[PDB]
Design an enzyme around this catalytic site. Structure first.
Site, PDB file in Angstrom:
ATOM      1  N   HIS A  40       0.839  -1.219   0.000  1.00  0.00           N
ATOM      2  CA  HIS A  40       0.000   0.000   0.000  1.00  0.00           C
ATOM      3  C   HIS A  40       0.868   1.262   0.000  1.00  0.00           C
ATOM      4  CE1 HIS A  40      -0.313  -0.043   4.438  1.00  0.00           C
ATOM      5  NE2 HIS A  40      -0.341   1.258   4.280  1.00  0.00           N
ATOM      6  N   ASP A  84      -0.207  -7.509   1.654  1.00  0.00           N
ATOM      7  CA  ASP A  84       0.342  -6.141   1.666  1.00  0.00           C
ATOM      8  C   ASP A  84       1.842  -6.195   1.936  1.00  0.00           C
ATOM      9  OD1 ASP A  84       0.336  -3.351   1.549  1.00  0.00           O
ATOM     10  OD2 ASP A  84      -0.578  -3.227   3.523  1.00  0.00           O
ATOM     11  N   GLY A 175       1.555   6.745   8.499  1.00  0.00           N
ATOM     12  CA  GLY A 175       2.986   7.134   8.425  1.00  0.00           C
ATOM     13  C   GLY A 175       3.811   5.975   9.029  1.00  0.00           C
ATOM     14  N   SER A 177       3.136   2.789   8.418  1.00  0.00           N
ATOM     15  CA  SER A 177       2.935   1.836   7.340  1.00  0.00           C
ATOM     16  C   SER A 177       4.220   1.482   6.556  1.00  0.00           C
ATOM     17  CB  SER A 177       2.007   2.529   6.283  1.00  0.00           C
ATOM     18  OG  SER A 177       0.690   2.489   6.787  1.00  0.00           O
ATOM     19  N   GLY A 178       4.320   0.171   6.403  1.00  0.00           N
ATOM     20  CA  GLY A 178       5.405  -0.541   5.704  1.00  0.00           C
ATOM     21  C   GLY A 178       6.579  -0.783   6.660  1.00  0.00           C
TER      22      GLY A 178
END
Ligand SMILES: [Ca+2]
Ligand SMILES: [Ca+2]
Lengths: 223, 223
Positions: A40, A84, A175, A177-178
Site C-alpha cells: 500500500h 500487503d 505514516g 505503514s510498511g
C-alpha cells in the site's frame, strides 16, 4: 506510533523512511540492496533514506538512495490489504555499518505472546495528527489469532497478524505503514492497517512475513 | 471535516485547495486575485486550485493558478497560532463564474449562537486519518468566548473564536486548515487549530477575521 518512546539514536538500524518529497512510509533493510515495505506504500518514484534518527535534521549518518525496482506482491488486494508486501531494489548497494544494518527474515512464525518491537515516524496521536521528527519505538505483544478475528470480523486472512494492546493507548498509525515488526531479532510483520489509532478493542494488523519468505527470496534472486 | 456531509457540487464557490503536489490546506477567494488562508499553511510555492469538487478528479470546472505573493500576517506567532492569517496574491486573476466565486469580508464580528458553514478536504476521522475526495461541509455554531476559554485555558486570544460542538463527533481536522468559516454569507473565521479532532470538550479554534479587515484591505491595496 502512539504512546511509544523515542528510540535510542540509530538503535533500529534496519529502519528506513520512504520519501517522496516527505516521509510517507517505513520499510526494513533486508540486504545491502533491498527493502521490504507494504504494497500500500507503492509510488512510482521513491527515495529510500537509511541511517535516520531525526527525519528533519541531517545528523551525519544518512544514506539517501533512489528505489530502482519497486515490486508489489502479485496478489496484493488494494481492497482487503491481503498480501500487503512490496520489495524495493535500491539503485545501488548501501554501506552497511553501525547505523545502517540489515534485519533477518523469520525462521518461523512467532507465537502469540511474543514481545516485538515496532518503529516509525508515523502519527503520534490517538485523535488529530502529530508527525514526529525522531524515530518512535513501541514494545508490544503478538495476539492470538482468535482476538485478531474477533476484532475485525471477516477481515483477517492468514497473511495477517494482530499486534498490540486491546485496552488502547498505544499503537501504530498513519505514516508507520510498511515499517517493521521485529521479534527476537527477526522481521515478523509489516505495519499494515487497523481502525483508528490506539483505540480500545482495535488492535493493529500486520502482514505476516513468515508467509512470504519464499516469495521474498525468489524475487530477490530473479531481480 | 469529521461528521460533516458532502457539499452539493460547486455549492461553496469561494473554497480553494492549496496544493504543493497534494492538497495541504484550504483557503477562501475574496477577489479575483486574492485568497485568504492560515499563516500556518505558508509554503514558498503553492498552486491554488479553484472550482474543485472532487480533488482527485478533473471534473471540468477547475482553475489552477500559482501563488505569486504569499503574505503571512506580520504578527503571526507560530507558537501560539495568534494572528494565523495569510494572504495569497494569484499570479493572475481567475474567471469568476458559478463555480468560482468570491466570499464577502465581514461587516462585523458574528455573535455567539450564529450558525456557520465550515468546509474542507481535511481528515474525516476522529482517530486515524481518512482524506476525502469530495468537499465536506459542516453546519456549526459560534460558541461564547467563555466556553472557548474554558476549553483551552490560557491559549485563546481575542483574535480567536471557537466554533463547534462541546459534545464531540463533528469538527474540522488536519487538511481543513486555512479554510472558511462562513456565517450569513460572510467570512467570519479561518480554520486554525483544536486538540484532537471531533472530541468532546475540545472545540475548534478559528482566526477571527473581523479583527483583520483593515489589514486585509491595506495589504491588497499595497500589493
Ligand atoms: Ca536525519
Ligand atoms: Ca477536480
Amino acid at each position: 506510533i502512539v504512546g511509544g518512546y523515542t528510540c535510542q539514536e540509530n538503535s533500529v538500524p534496519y529502519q528506513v523512511s520512504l520519501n517522496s518529497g516527505y516521509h510517507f512510509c517505513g520499510g526494513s533493510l533486508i540486504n545491502d540492496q533491498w527493502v521490504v515495505s507494504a504494497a500500500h506504500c507503492y509510488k512510482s518514484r521513491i527515495q529510500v533514506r537509511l541511517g535516520e534518527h531525526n527525519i528533519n535534521v541531517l545528523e551525519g549518518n544518512e544514506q539517501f538512495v533512489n528505489a530502482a525496482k519497486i515490486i508489489k506482491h502479485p496478489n496484493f488486494d488494494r481492497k482487503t490489504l491481503n498480501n500487503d508486501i512490496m520489495l524495493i531494489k535500491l539503485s545501488s548497494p548501501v554501506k552497511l555499518n553501525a547505523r545502517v544494518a540489515t534485519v533477518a527474515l523469520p525462521s518461523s512464525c512467532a507465537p502469540a505472546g511474543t514481545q516485538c518491537l515496532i518503529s516509525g515516524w508515523g502519527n503520534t496521536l490517538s485523535s488529530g495528527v502529530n508527525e514526529p521528527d525522531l524515530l518512535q519505538c513501541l514494545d508490544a505483544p503478538l495476539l492470538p489469532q482468535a482476538d485478531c478475528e474477533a476484532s475485525y470480523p471477516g477481515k483477517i486472512t492468514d497473511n495477517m497478524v494482530c499486534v498490540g494492546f486491546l485496552e488502547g493507548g498505544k499503537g501504530s498509525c498513519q505514516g508507520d505503514s510498511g515499517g517493521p515488526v521485529v521479534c527476537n531479532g527477526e522481521l515478523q510483520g509489516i505495519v499494515s492497517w487497523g481502525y483508528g489509532c490506539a483505540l480500545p478493542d482495535n488492535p493493529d494488523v500486520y502482514t505476516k512475513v513468515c508467509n512470504y519468505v519464499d516469495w521474498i527470496q525468489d524475487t530477490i534472486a530473479a531481480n
